[PDB]
Amino acid sequence: AVKADRLWHDKYALRKPMIPSFMTMDQCRKVLLIGKSINFLHQVCHDQTPTTKMIAVADLFTDLENAFQGKIDAAYFETSKYLLDVLNKKYSLLDHMQAMRRYL
Amino acid sequence: MPREIITLQLGQCGNQIGFEFWKQLCAEHGISPEGIVEEFATEGTDRKDVFFYQADDEHYIPRAVLLDLEPRVIHSILNSPYAKLYNPENIYLSEHGGGAGNNWASGFSQGEKIHEDIFDIIDREADGSDSLEGFVLCHSIAGGTGSGLGSYLLERLNDRYPKKLVQTYSVFPNVVVQPYNSLLTLKRLTQNADCVVVLDNTALNRIATDRLHIQNPSFSQINQLVSTIMSASTTTLRYPGYMNNDLIGLIASLIPTPRLHFLMTGYTPLTTDQSVASVRKTTVLDVMRRLLQPKNVMVSTGRDRQTNHCYIAILNIIQGEVDPTQVHKSLQRIRERKLANFIPWGPASIQVALSRKSPYLPSAHRVSGLMMANHTSISSLFESSCQQYDKLRKREAFLEQFRKEDIFKENFDELDRSREVVQELIDEYHAATRPDYISWGT
């Protein structure tokens, strides 16, 4: 129901009844942030290309709270950094804010 | 729609001021001496359509007309590197090299004789300018062409474009008929010029001698200071923002109205490139204190113990990386400390505009600030001019050349009217010094 305009607003949610006890709300939030950044790139930023690093990336079930949680946090950080780089290069959200300060 | 400004350069001093202003504008827009924009100026921060005319080959031709009664200055400009920058069709020079003979009446007669070329150039500029705000007339009040021709051009511009602001760069004297020419120029500025920017030669020489350590300063330094001041006048037009970037608005802000057209100019820092200002981190407070220093005022106003001069209105154009919090704090501190005496008959007009300098102009000072203030101390210069006019009129000094003119062939009633107007202006600025000034006679 939330389109690319509201993809970061409402198109991403968490199903609490569908959440396990072997995971964490913070880990779920980090994974959701990474996935939302990727989906925004795919559709909100319209960059439908796949990621080579993500392509290169039971035991994981027991390791969800292990170093795999740090891997999820790093994936979220990398997706956010790529989004920030794309914004500073072409989207210029910070430049838009500076222009609004200059004019309005 | 571009907002073009037409520059009228009359007399040698006026031509030098106009040429220096054009060179400063070209440097700020990264335009070479031939008028072409430099490769590094493709990203210039100023739109050249605002001040200069653009040729079909991406050549910036300033919208300035250099009128001189002597061919020497015209030839020197055409032999200068900036000859190709100026359009040859926008400059008119009288073929008769006789000049005005240091007579205001003869200068006015010569201007009326060459009114066709100047008027045609002005009409062409106005028709060719989309949003022409007005014209800037740069001339000397003591010279012949600049005074007489300047007054004639100001009257013609006021009559044809009463809705257009008339800004003048009047070089105030520090010629036996000089008192008469000065009185006539002051009357012309008061009656037909919306704003007259006084450039006191004595004050400029004093500042140069005090700060530049130049023994026997040359006219080149004065011309460069005038160019820097005029560049600071257009510095407010460079940075997109909020308030006070119209020529008429600047006139109303620095010289309250066309009646109060006597405005003082202030520049800071006043120091040469060879003198290292001791790592004084230029604070808004320090910049304001330097501008508020009497030695930093570009107008030589007598320290009269009888008249209490006060600031009528102040418009400060600060160019550079300035924090608005610091600017507000400096304004607040000046108001609290009463660093500036505002006219008691009017609201305290203290405006500070944050502007960005032209990217192509190297600034030795990180933050620069130009102060254009309408102050009662300009009346000290008006009083001195009136006293000189009365002294010359009583002894009929240097009246033979005026009598040789048709305007003064019969009598000098025009000179009497000018002296009366100058006395009225002096007494009006004296009322401006009183709180009753707003409804003084009003």
Q: Supply the DSSP string of B280-293, one letter for each residue.
A: ----HHHHHHHHHS
Residues of A whose CB is below 8 A from B242: none
Residue of A nearest to B354 (CA): A102
Residue of B nearest to A101 (CA): B241
Measured between CA atoms, how close is B25 to chain A, in angstroms? 24
Phi, psi of B340 (to 5 degrees): -125, 125
Task: Look up residue A97 and give its two tokens.
Answer: 């804010």
Rounded Cα distance between B89 and B359, Å, is: 30
Rounded Cα distance between B277 and B244, Å, is: 31
Rounded Cα distance between B32 and B48, Å, is: 13
Sequence-distant contacts of B46-49: CB under 8 A, at least 24 apart: B46/B237, B46/B238, B46/B358, B47/B2, B49/B2, B49/B4
Rounded Cα distance between B222 and B146, Å, is: 17
Rounded Cα distance between B165 and B249, Å, is: 9
Residue A90: how many CB atoms within 10 A of its CB? 8
Cβ contact B415:B103 at 8 Å: no
Among all chains, which residue has been given the structure tokens 């400063």?
Answer: B24
Measured between CA atoms, how close is A103 to chain B, in angstroms? 6
Residues of A whose CB is below 8 A from B241: 102
Rounded Cα distance between B102 and B416, Å, is: 19
Rounded Cα distance between A97 and A77, Å, is: 23
Measuring CA to CA, which residue among B159, B320, B169, B298 is closest to residue B221? B298
Angle, vertex CA B418, rays to CA B415 and CA B422, nearest 5: 140
Phi, psi of B34 (to 5 degrees): -85, 0
Q: Does A104 touch chain B (CB under 8 A)?
A: no
Residue of A nearest to B243 (CA): A103
Exposed / middle / buried, residue B268 (Cβ in 10 Å: 0-12, 13-18, 19+): buried
Measuring CA to CA, which residue among B365, B358, B296, B369 is closest to residue B326? B369
Question: How many angstroms from the chain centroid is the CA of residue B94?
Answer: 25
Task: Look up residue A93 and give its two tokens.
Answer: 């959200």
Residues of A whose CB is below 8 A from B240: 102-103
Query: What is the phi-psi region of residue B291: left when phi exceeds 0, alpha when psi lies from -120 to 50, beta otherwise?
Result: alpha
Residues of B whose CB is below 8 A from A100: none
Per the document, the length of chain B is 442
Measuring CA to CA, which residue among B381, B388, B391, B390 is closest to residue B429? B381
Task: Look up residue B337 and give its two tokens.
Answer: 């400390």
Chain B residues contacting A via beta carbons under 8 Å:
240-241
Measured between CA atoms, how close is A98 to chain B, in angstroms? 12
Q: Does A16 touch chain B (CB under 8 A)?
A: no
Measured between CA atoms, how close is B376 to chain A, in angstroms? 36
DSSP H helices in B199-338: 201-211, 219-233, 247-254, 284-292, 324-336
Residue of B nearest to A103 (CA): B241
Total CB pairs under 8 A between chain A and B: 3
Phi, psi of B161 (to 5 degrees): -130, 70
Technique that determined the structure: cryo-EM
Measured between CA atoms, how close is B244 to chain A, in angstroms? 14
Strand partners, B266: B297, B371
Q: List the B350-355 sheet strands across, edge first.
A: B64-67, B5-10, B134-140, B165-172, B195-200, B262-268, B367-375, B311-320, B350-355
Task: Look up residue B270 and give its two tokens.
Answer: 């006043």
Residue of A nearest to B242 (CA): A103
Exposed / middle / buried, residue B397 (Cβ in 10 Å: 0-12, 13-18, 19+): middle
Cβ contact B318:B351 at 8 Å: no
Rounded Cα distance between B69 and B106, Å, is: 12
Measured between CA atoms, how close is A81 to chain B, in angstroms? 30
Rounded Cα distance between B393 and B417, Å, is: 12
Q: Does A102 touch chain B (CB under 8 A)?
A: yes
Rounded Cα distance between B367 and B356, Å, is: 10
Breaks (C-N over 2.5 A) in chain B follow: 174
Measuring CA to CA, which residue among B198, B316, B312 is closest to residue B257? B312
Residues of B whose CB is below 8 A from A98: none
Residues of B whose CB is below 8 A from A103: 240
Residues of B whose CB is below 8 A from A102: 240-241
Chain A residues 30-89 with CB within 8 Å of chain B = none
